[PDB]
Amino acid sequence: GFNLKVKDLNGSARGLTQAFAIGELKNQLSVGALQLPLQFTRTFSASMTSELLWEVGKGNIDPVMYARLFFQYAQAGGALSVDELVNQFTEYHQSTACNPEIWRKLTAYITGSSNRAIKADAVGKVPPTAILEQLRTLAPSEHELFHHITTDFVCHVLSPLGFILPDAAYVYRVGRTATYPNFYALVDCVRASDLRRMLTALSSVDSKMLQATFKAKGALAPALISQHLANAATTAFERSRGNFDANAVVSSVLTILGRLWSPSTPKELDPSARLRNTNGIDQLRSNLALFIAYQDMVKQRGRAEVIFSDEELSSTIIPWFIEAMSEVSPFKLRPINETTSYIGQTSAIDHMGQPSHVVVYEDWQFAKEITAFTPVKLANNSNQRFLDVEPGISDRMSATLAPIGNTFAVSAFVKNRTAVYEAVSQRGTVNSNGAEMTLGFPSVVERDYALDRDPMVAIAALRTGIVDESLEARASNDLKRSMFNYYAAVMHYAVAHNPEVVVSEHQGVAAEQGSLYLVWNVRTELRIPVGYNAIEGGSIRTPEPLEAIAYNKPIQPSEVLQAKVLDLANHTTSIHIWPWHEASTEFAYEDAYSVTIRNKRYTAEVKEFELLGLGQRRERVRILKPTVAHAIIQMWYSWFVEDDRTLAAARRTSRDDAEKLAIDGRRMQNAVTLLRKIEMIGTTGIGASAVHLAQSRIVDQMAGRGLIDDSSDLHVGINRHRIRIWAGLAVLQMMGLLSRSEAEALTKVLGDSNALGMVVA
Amino acid sequence: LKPTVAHAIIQMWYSWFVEDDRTLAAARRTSRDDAEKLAIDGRRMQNAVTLLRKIEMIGTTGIGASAVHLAQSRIVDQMAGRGLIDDSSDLHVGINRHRIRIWAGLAVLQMMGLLSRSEAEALTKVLGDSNALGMVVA
Amino acid sequence: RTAVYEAVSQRGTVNSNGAEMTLGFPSVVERDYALDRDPMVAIAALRTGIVDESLEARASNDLKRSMFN
Amino acid sequence: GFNLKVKDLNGSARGLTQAFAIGELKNQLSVGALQLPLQFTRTFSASMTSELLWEVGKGNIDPVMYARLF
Amino acid sequence: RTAVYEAVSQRGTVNSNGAEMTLGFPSVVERDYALDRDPMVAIAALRTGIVDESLEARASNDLKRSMFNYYAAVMHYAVAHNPEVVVSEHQGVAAEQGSLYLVWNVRTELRIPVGYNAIEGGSIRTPEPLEAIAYNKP
Amino acid sequence: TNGIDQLRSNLALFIAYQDMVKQRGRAEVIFSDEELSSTIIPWFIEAMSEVSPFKLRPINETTSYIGQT
């Protein structure tokens, strides 16, 4: 997790200001009043968890399926924007009519030189993909994907009444995707919708051509409708010359929505009553995270009012459509009440009783089991591979994670984190300007870390507010998405609490008063200073969502919070291949234990191995790291290094002996935290394996030199706890979770303190 | 006994395949004129594909499933005997499966008193270039 | 094989027949294979027509024993 | 008589591990969890010891004993 | 040998099992020694498990003729202690022709430096018959 | 059928299924029927025809020669 001050926050982390999204640049705080009331449809969203595997290649074909696939592909960062995927796709099937030969040759597969026409059909369907790999020689395909696409028309079932088999399909694993959207994500949505406008007609045409085909004869003679097949689809491809223009339409519905927001009356911003109605927008005004997307792209690209729309006809064609009313996005529009709620609340009491520890937190049970893949490549001799799930490290390590599936529950974490509770004297005097604002989400880490980037750098970029901006455009991307997902998540969750919101320019640089933020209100909070407001008027009135967050009364989490976890043995006997890599290849790696007693080096040196007790190596497998399982413990890692370096900065600053007592107790209580945690980690059964076996090895080392064979001399007290960590080290790296540069940290922190048991055991 | 009849059928089938692939291969060798070559080489494929399919019916449906069974036994036990069963995923897919299956139906066919043995090696010789791919299994 | 016929275009036709096309007799095979003589050798013997005089009362004439049928 | 490790018995007397009675080897040592219970009860008895002569003898012929003999 | 147990101190225990300890069957010896086959060779054959394929109808199978009984041994007194049962068919990835043995929850002491299946929780469940005895009273 | 259920009680002959899949594989009932069997065949099972050292008994007596320390 992670925390801020309650009074200050901009001096703690600029990223959660509305102002930073507004690009206010640290200076003046937003406050400007003169307000317009709102309401909630609790706003459009995504899913949150959707780990599943589509079938393709079975010849059913449905654009909504592929839309997810390309969308996920960009979410894999396989190229970049979906829009790029699409323009490059059209660049691909600019091999459109310039290649009649696609028909002439696939029909040649139908056998062929079909001027020798007849009810020729016999058998063969399901792998034109290879003869179409010859079509890849005809249609080179640096991407696997569209090459894997085009097969379908000839072989969805065509000719639907024979050809014939498949008895086989294909594969891909969509994972859960991004939680909340943005400019690029949206244009990717509507772009995916132009593709939606593509493929469905592309199926329907053939769907009727087949009706007009088997005139009988039987399937009738070729070099015709077959030789047709998709020429009409090419015309359908030419029906696709003009959907819209994604950035323009998105910017359009955007800024017109903003005009619907802004106080600014005049003709530049006068949403016509001629069209203030007309469906959709009437609830679409209510969406609010979508509104965050507004202020976001308003932040990046100014406003750039192309206003492709008129005032009414047609201010209709442009908002004919948008992403939620697309199914093309994994993301989906959202009903009324729950918003996206699933976080409880508690708050510190000094019997006064203003909070000093805000408690806002997670809600999430991590995977109970994970399974290794055996990369049995054989077909194609390239990317094509089979994984064949089988038990291995799997079952046993999983059962060992079950206790971790208890003792590292988030509820227990925050509950202990809440137990930090009493601090700076007593009791009853803990208050002093700011107060800690602890928080964190399952999502931001589960995704940004899934991209393999280490979220904490972005987190710190938020903490300083200002972007490091030295990153690769890829990392530039992960940073951006990190930002608006943090921010917006906090926004619309905070919104999920407080019922009412009002629009607020800002002013400052105006830059034409279109720039704007929000201010909120609640009353129940006790007459105490809190944030800039205090509470002022018996009511909040704050720009800043965190402020409304702090005042909220304690509650409970709602969502099923489960990791759901994938399975695939079915699809595995089916596979085939897909962009899978990221796992990656060789399931684990050794870590080397060491210790000294009687002033002698020993170095236990253990692998990897199954370690569990059946050799050897194994080999080969690789298991996926759960995003979640490492993400959560990384939240805590962020806490560890947080209290470490920051309160060490306190060790540097306030040299007051009482403040000395504070840094003492706090750093040494995170110390007792990881202490007792690894402590319970050592009792784990694999931990038991590491204990007995590594101890067996170094006892064998005792037998090395003949005089230090004088029985065990390690065991007294300190050594046991001292090696107890080693169990937490196997549980660390190559348990499939922690990423090293970690035990590193833990080592230094375990050096920071006396540790000991500290008692128990 | 030494059952008759069927021998003539399967032989005719065998030799006629010989006529088949000879003709088609010559056709692609020159005829000439692309529109036809892919046709025949396309044709070629499903011909083999056709036989592929029917060969499973020869076997893994009574009683050559016993054959693949025992083959799996002997091979994995051989893995253990040479030591590692480590690499032995080989109860799995296609290539090995086409291998063992076609071998199986062909094998019970060997136990069938008709078609010798040369026909077997020639047959797998046929499928081997053609493609094999599928993945029809399953 | 009938299906093979369309392979390979295009039409000849005078320059080279025509074809046997026709025989593939189950009967002729079984008649000889019953004695496990292997008919297939007898086949070419009808290609050239003349018997290759494998002088043995259960060799040569048996070939001819088929040819009649 | 002989000996073998308990944890490593599959790496040891691998045939004796009952999982071997099935073709199982795998990354996994059989098992998992599932369902239907009933102690399988009443085993066929003790053929050990109980050695004795029998008489074929009479032509009155008992097939039964002769079977046992077969 | 029981007396040997105190040799040699001191306590391990996790680093290296555990031990067979258990078998020394008069029965398995006599069953084979009656044919003067010498059981002792069959013994190692169950060490590696796989038969060494001494191909002869009164050689190889006779080894296996014992091995069956050998399995047949433990299961029976794996009945008493405990009537715990089932287990599943264990299809794995290949191949579901059926594959279901038996399981034994028994009941246990709360420590498990014995059995890879840590499943101490109340008791072992358990995948293999011997562990029951391993957790059994004398 | 007033007997095969006694076999439901004779489930001691377990392991037979084990090697059955192992010695062989799929266990198709092939002469299955559905009336049969039932009907006669399980009735016609050996132990009830009692040849052999096939032997028959309750539980532990066979175990009643197991040492334990």
Author numbering:
A (entry chain B): 1 to 761
B (entry chain A): 624 to 761
C (entry chain A): 417 to 485
D (entry chain A): 1 to 70
E (entry chain A): 417 to 554
F (entry chain A): 278 to 346
Give sentences from the paper:
Here, we present a general computational method termed ‘localized reconstruction' for solving structures of symmetry-mismatched parts of macromolecular complexes. The method allows symmetry-mismatched and/or flexible subunits to be treated as isolated single particles separate from the rest of the complex, facilitating their classification, refinement and reconstruction. To demonstrate how localized reconstruction can be used to address symmetry-mismatched components, we focused on the RNA-dependent RNA polymerase of bacteriophage φ6.
We apply the method to two published cryo-EM data sets, namely unfixed COPII cages and the VP4 spikes of triple-layered rotavirus particles, in addition to an unpublished data set of polymerase complexes of double-stranded RNA bacteriophage φ6. Others have previously located the RNA-dependent RNA polymerase under the fivefold symmetry positions in the rotavirus and under the threefold symmetry positions in bacteriophage φ6 polymerase complex using conventional icosahedral reconstruction. Such an approach applies incorrect symmetry to the symmetry-mismatched structures, such as the polymerase in these studies. The main requirement is that the macromolecular complex is amenable to single particle averaging and that its orientations can be reliably determined first.
